[PDB]
Paper text:
Malic enzyme 2 (ME2) is a mitochondrial enzyme that catalyzes the conversion of malate to pyruvate and has been proposed as a therapeutic target. Malic enzyme 2 (ME2) is one of three known isoforms of malic enzyme (ME1, ME2, and ME3), and one of two mitochondrial isoforms (ME2 and ME3). A major function of the malic enzymes is to convert malate to pyruvate, serving as a metabolic shunt to regulate TCA cycle activity under fluctuating external stresses.
The ME2/NPD-389 tetramer assembly is produced by crystallographic symmetry from the dimeric crystal structure. The inhibitor is localized within each active site adjacent to an NAD+ molecule. In each of the two unique active sites, NPD-389 coordinates Mg2+ through its central 2,5-dihydroxyl benzoquinone ring, displaying metal-oxygen distances of 2.0 Å. NPD-389 binding is competitive with respect to L-malate, with both molecules sharing the same site and metal coordination, which is consistent with the literature and our own enzyme kinetics and inhibition data. The 4-OMe-substituted phenyl groups of the symmetrical molecule project either into a non-polar pocket within the protein interior or out into the solvent space. Compared to L-malate binding, the Tyr112 residue, purportedly facilitating proton transfer in catalysis, rotates away from the active site and forms π–π ring-stacking interactions with the buried 4-OMe-substituted phenyl group of NPD-389. The solvent-exposed 4-OMe-substituted phenyl also forms potential π interactions with the Leu 167 backbone oxygen and the side chain of Arg 165.
Residue numbers in the entry:
A (entry chain A), C (entry chain A): 22 to 573
B (entry chain B): 22 to 574
Write the structure that this text describes.
């Protein structure tokens, strides 16, 4: 398309000093670059050297995210070199810190910004996006960014970082990814007073106009790019998150990772546990600390797993209890019970606990899952009560970051003599016990699911994503534990091999999508594995050398 | 020319969030920016707030040079806002530290790279340069980067930084500035071992090819851009610096800042000292610690300044003495004598000095100038020796960085008890003696000279720069001091006013060029002040809004 | 700058099928062109073949002017191949015919259009012109297009065609040429009723606004491109033409070809004649048929020639009489005498003619010059009266086109036994007389002057063009007649060698410009010939091949 300085200024084309001598000469770059040819390998090492001479995580974020705006293929190469250590940077927890000071660290814009001031003109904006074949859209209003609450347009970092992991893990063409931020104001007074805030100076609009903007946004996106365009909602308010999932679910090809992706990884760990504890599902009793979107999201998907294994809906629900901030979810309590909690709000026992430890002793659960985000509430005695009740208790401490976790690997494994099966939201290191026996805990990271699922949905031209897709993703993830990894005490495969794990998920989800008539991409491929591997985006530089030859 | 995302990837047009609502809508940026209209001020305050979060100078270099590549108008606004503090960052000393690791911090390339491997195809390379009306070239081989020696292609940071100051100070259009690095190899072993070295992995070619390559380079630039294109040689090795300056002085529009710019700023101080103490020029004698590039440069220019005032050639030279690392330069000594030094190699006194303190006592100088870059060799006893020999002694400690300076301001002013006239290369804060008097010493930075001179040479379409230009530039620098500032012991205007000072220098040089028939820009302007002040480049954002207006139906 | 289809769509870069194999491969053109390499020679022949299979002049114009918008270098090559025959097409007379039907034949726009509706916004328009270093501007209001009168914006063809001859003859870089049309309405009712008219539907504005538009236009041009920018006025109303020349002459670097260029070629022929008739200038009496801009233009320049040869102003004026539509210009006549005619309005004789033949017998002129544009008014007996009075009478029939000429070569040479010295505005073929003696008449074409002058003015950064520049151009033109050409009866060199003639004029005018301190381009060149030849624009294709080589 273009030659000269424009090639170097365009991230998609810019190879940097990896432009070969001929490329330089033939594309009019000779002299604009230093007289040295590099490879993507040399360029990558240079990054790792600079990254080592940096302590601050926020400095690492700003550096690496700058590389995206200079050389795209280098950027995604660098993530793929060591994804485990850099995923903390490009996404959580660091992305939170970046999102807090997002107006300070701003350098170059990265996504698409739709305001409530642009009401009725969303189509004009969408059309300004240079890329023509968008497949994956990630959107946020910024109201519920991680644990940091409302951050307005500073939330844009989340879409951006999310889509980095789409490309990095799954192989979704970056040029077909679109991060979107919906600015309708913000209730965060700190930001309104900040003169470097990048959003609108007004409180959140919660009128009809907000709903209308989302409708128009959804329409505008699909008008330009198609109805099969994948649209993921991220870090919306809990109220908005659920009701928008409901009203668009069967209309637009949309999912919510915070609900559905979270449920999937939760379940995938439970299913990993059942390769150890083979107890009939009839026996499993499950107790959630917290009754948030995370709880309800996970709860529903468990019920659906239980249903596919024999149990009814009514019965499977009665095997799930929830203990939130006001106490145990029971019928006829003064504390509020919302519509989504009603199915898990159960007939009260004789003794009605006022403590979580009290509940564990009364209800005799085989599994406790922590999603309160309210610190260390799985007390040492809670851990013990579970070890007395179950021979191998399943304890899931999912809250993030580490400081909000309900308990620690250390705290879990040692207080149950290394019997329990543990998994966490935040990364804990190998625990060592006094008998010289190693236990390597797994991490319940959402990145196990959404990339693979997203690739499959896109590759199959799927138009709606049913809850049973995430159920199939769960089974798919769990089916990649080797025996060794289970012996070591992992309920998830290593994050190190996320790329491979993401693909195999995409494959197994593609098969399911065709088998249940949710794929509209025909002709149907016979070998789904080949079909997926072939279409994943590679970070290797392509030649940009024009073809010169003699005429014989 | 362009619309959409290209306007934001092009730093000459990119206003960032300073794009108005009208501009965003009409240019198709609406939605690509956050919904927040800023101004150049807010953007600037953001930069200032973030600069404080950084502690390392090198972090700051990387952050600020980054802005040149995102937003050019914003970049030069940031420099002009706080020029005094950020000039250390953008250029010396921090550019030295950056130049050392230039390949380790490389993100985007900034200039034009001509290797020896491109011999015969140099015009090809010149023609790849996007800009069509280049007026100012700064070129480096990389052989003698500051006091760091041979950094080779790492030396590119020097031209890049220096042209920032052309623009920042004098208002020379950035799009007409071309930084160039001639790459002929490097003698530095560490770099030849480095897998991130950005140059050719070979020793410096010192053969005939090197000379040919510089010839070809000079021809190629002036072919494309014209013969009056200003070509400034920077940080070449001594041998080459002088010989090329001689070879091209009369053929192209060229100068060397390390020689001629240094001389101008040196002389500017000496003349300002002369204003304080009306010492007859016959009753002056100059002692240089060091007899290299800086010494020889300042020497040759001083001679002219004396000759101008009445002295002859030989007369003025005999008032200038040089003491190098082998000792005092005297006729028929043991250590060798370069031909440029020969004029300042006199017949030995009766007692040949073996140290510098000796020389001060034997020769009884009025002024010592330190350009050896070898630490605190103006020992306390030397400052005292001068303090007793002269009523008002002039002491110039020009060596950089601070650690290689011959003495501090504190050391100079206390051991002379206020009676000293002091200047240095490195910045020394205010010196407050016990008795109550405060002395603010002048910094003898080259940046006083080269911006103003370059601007003048360019606006007058001058084809050659004789040494009298720098002489005339020196007087122009000296003449901007207030009497109050002379009473404060300043021999140089504040760096806070480098802009006002650079323009005023450019004006006076313009008058000189026209008055002495060295200008070729006719018709000749009458008011030279208005001419210069009108052609300076501004950092204020231009509107990119196309004109919408109504036609009678 | 650019590669691919854009190179082929850009006239300045487009070489057509003359793109070499390597160029095609290296610039991404391989496949977009037919598999055949041509030269500019092959491409040129193709043009000449097509031009031969066309009768209509208007078809030839549309074809060749299309080539300018496809391949610029080919276009100017083709003019330089046979300039003599094609100059009739690109300019007069055909350009007149094209200008009449300009809205019909419109295909692609060619110049810059400034309307009175764009009052106060002329700078915006000027800035829309893509070219950055304009040197030669030709502008028209369209009020007095050739003989066709007011044609409004259809007059744009004139600037365009004029500037074709700038490039074709002189070598003025086409990219530095700017044709401008000032639309202020038109009095031509035929055009106002035409629904394909390309100008404004209103009568000519003759208020202050017109004058103001011209001021702003002049300012805007010079603001962007400089005060030394050459601005030529063409085919303005006679009133406007003179007064605009006067008020801007010493302000903007401006000339008018219809006045000054016309005067120059007139004089150059008179000076050619004086190499035959060596009579002292004191004896020369001159009589103009018509007292138009052409008459007055020529008259003044003659006076200035006479002055440089010894005569005073008052005396030199008395040697010039004028006979216009109302009769002989005499003091105290009922017919109007304008300010410019006053110097040539003389003390009445005893007998005051009412016929032009009557005047020739009374006043005894040695030279008659026809610029009435009113047909054959040099009656056969006029021709004879001149032959009886003078041994070699100088008869100049300058009116155009041929039908408006005052007499013919045939009519002139035979009615004076082949004694007279004749020149015409329109081309007449070699006359043959009954004694087997050939007389080849010259043409008083303005193209002899303005290209050479224009090149010199531009190359010398001249800021004002004095009348004595055109006087020097005249002497320069005449100094290129060989003796043979004078023997044959030519008062001008062949149009065939206009390119060479234009350059030599530019050289001699450059020398004069430096010698009289009108050049601001220093350093001054020592050899003016080399200086000019070096800087003329060539039509040869340049290589567009990027430099590829090995690294030794
Ligand atoms: N660069 C190329 O050579 C190129 C590029 C695109 C398509 N094609 C050709 O077109 C055929 C059909 O391609 P298609 O795109 O219409 O359908 P497809 O069968 O190749 O892909 C199905 C769907 O998945 C999307 N998709 C595929 N890979 C993706 C990725 N890495 N990231 C995001 N979205 C991705 C496509 O846009 C499409 O909507 C291909 O089989 C190939 O022959 C070639
Ligand atoms: N590991 C993962 O993949 C993953 C994914 C999503 C969310 N999470 C984590 O889940 C946690 C909850 O997120 P959420 O979106 O459900 O938030 P939420 O506000 O919707 O849920 C919080 C719930 O905890 C309850 N609670 C608060 N303090 C309590 C206390 N002291 N005792 C008992 N109950 C208490 C609240 O009443 C509420 O029911 C967070 O810490 C978040 O980091 C983890
Ligand atoms: N302040 C300014 O504007 C400015 C401008 C240019 C140069 N300088 C300074 O000038 C200094 C020298 O630069 P240069 O290019 O002339 O270097 P150079 O290598 O050309 O000259 C060094 C000279 O010092 C002599 N020398 C070295 N050690 C000595 C010692 N111990 N005692 C006596 N003489 C000794 C050497 O023999 C030689 O003659 C540097 O420190 C540099 O910072 C300052
Ligand atoms: N061209 C037009 O001509 C007039 C001026 O002509 P000109 O462009 O030759 O300039 P000029 O005649 O005003 O100045 C003469 C020279 O100065 C240069 N120059 C002016 N400002 C400069 C700057 N800020 N940085 C670097 N070089 C600078 C020019 O390129 C030229 O070489 C203006 O009207 C302009 O738009
Ligand atoms: N393509 C090239 O290589 C190229 C192009 C332009 C200039 N140059 C270099 O710049 C030097 C100075 O060029 P300059 O233009 O400033 O001055 P110049 O001395 O070459 O020309 C003087 C003036 O005439 C104009 N001019 C020259 N040739 C012309 C033409 N054919 N048509 C119209 N206008 C014409 C110029 O624009 C200028 O205003 C040249 O001597 C050359 O070294 C090179
Ligand atoms: N050969 C050239 O280079 C050249 C250049 C310019 C104009 N011309 C020709 O000159 C002629 C006049 O052009 P102009 O611009 O001076 O027009 P104009 O209207 O200014 O001049 C016409 C003059 O002829 C007079 N006239 C008209 N009919 C007459 C008659 N029957 N008897 C006597 N006088 C009569 C008018 O009164 C007026 O004085 C045109 O035919 C034009 O083609 C030739
Ligand atoms: C309301 O309190 C919350 C709720 C959810 C979160 C999230 C997480 O705890 C995640 O781990 C999380 C997440 C982390 C990693 C990941 O793949 C890299 C995907 C999601 C989120 O998106 C969250 O919103 C944080 C605080
Ligand atoms: C040989 O040792 C040297 C020689 C010269 C130098 C230079 C300086 O000491 C400068 O101050 C210097 C300089 C510094 C600032 C400036 O304007 C900001 C211009 C020149 C140079 O270019 C040098 O080369 C340093 C060490
Ligand atoms: C008013 O009647 C007129 C006046 C002038 C003309 C012109 C000519 O007769 C030209 O020859 C003429 C011209 C012709 C050729 C040329 O070089 C090719 C330059 C001018 C004009 O520009 C005229 O305006 C025509 C009719
Ligand atoms: Mg989230
Ligand atoms: Mg230097
Ligand atoms: Mg005309």
């Amino acid at each position: 398309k273009e030659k000269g300085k424009p090639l170097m200024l365009n991230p998609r084309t810019n190879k940097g000093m990896a432009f070969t001598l001929q490329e330089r000469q033939m594309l009019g770059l000779q002299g604009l670059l230093p007289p040295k040819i590099e490879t993507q390998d040399i360029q990558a090492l240079r990054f790792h050297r600079n990254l080592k001479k940096m302590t601050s995580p926020l400095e690492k974020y700003i550096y690496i995210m700058g590389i995206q705006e200079r050389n795209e293929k280098l950027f995604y190469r660098i993530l793929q070199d060591d994804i485990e250590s850099l995923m903390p940077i490009v996404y959580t927890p660091t992305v939170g810190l970046a999102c807090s000071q997002y107006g300070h660290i701003f350098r170059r814009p990265k996504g698409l910004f739709i305001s409530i001031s642009d009401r009725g003109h969303v189509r004009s904006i969408v059309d300004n996006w240079p890329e023509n074949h968008v497949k994956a859209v990630v959107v946020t209003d910024g109201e519920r960014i991680l644990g940091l609450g409302d951050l307005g347009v500073y939330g844009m970092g989340i879409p951006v970082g999310k889509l980095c992991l789409y490309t990095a893990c799954a192989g979704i063409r970056p040029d077909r990814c679109l991060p979107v931020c919906i600015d309708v104001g913000t209730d965060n007074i700190a930001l309104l007073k900040d003169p470097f805030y990048m959003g609108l100076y007004q409180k959140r609009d919660r009128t009809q106009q907000y709903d209308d903007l989302i409708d128009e946004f959804m329409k505008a996106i699909t008008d330009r790019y198609g109805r099969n365009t994948l649209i993921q909602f991220e870090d919306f308010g809990n109220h908005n998150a659920f009701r928008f999932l409901r009203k668009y679910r069967e209309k637009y090809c949309t999912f919510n990772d915070d609900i559905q992706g979270t449920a999937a990884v939760a379940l995938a760990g439970l299913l990993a546990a059942q390769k150890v504890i083979s107890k009939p599902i009839s026996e499993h009793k499950i107790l959630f600390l917290g009754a948030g979107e995370a709880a309800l999201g996970i709860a529903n998907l468990i019920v659906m797993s239980m249903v596919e294994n024999g149990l009814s809906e009514q019965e499977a629900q009665k095997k799930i209890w929830m203990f939130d901030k006001y106490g145990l979810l029971v019928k006829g309590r003064k504390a509020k019970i919302d519509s989504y909690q009603e199915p898990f709000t159960h007939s009260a026992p004789e003794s009605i606990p006022d403590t979580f430890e009290d509940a564990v002793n009364i209800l005799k659960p085989s599994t406790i899952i922590g999603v309160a985000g309210a610190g260390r509430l799985f007390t040492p005695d809670v851990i013990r009560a579970m070890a007395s009740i179950n021979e191998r208790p399943v304890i899931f401490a999912l809250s993030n970051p580490t400081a909000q976790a309900e308990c620690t690997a250390e705290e879990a494994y040692t207080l149950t003599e290394g019997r329990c099966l543990f998994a966490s939201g935040s990364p804990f290191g190998p625990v060592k016990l006094t008998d010289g026996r190693v236990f390597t805990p797994g991490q319940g990271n959402n990145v196990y699911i959404f990339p693979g699922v997203a690739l499959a949905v896109i590759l199959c031209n799927t138009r709606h994503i049913s809850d049973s897709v995430f159920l199939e993703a769960a089974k798919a993830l769990t089916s990649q534990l080797t025996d060794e990894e289970l012996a070591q005490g992992r309920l998830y495969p290593p994050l190190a091999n996320i790329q491979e794990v993401s693909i195999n998920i995409a494959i197994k989800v593609t098969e399911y999508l065709y088998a249940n008539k949710m794929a509209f991409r025909y002709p149907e491929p016979e070998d789904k594995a080949k079909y997926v591997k072939e279409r994943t985006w590679r970070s290797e530089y392509d030649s940009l050398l024009p073809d010169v030859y003699e005429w014989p």
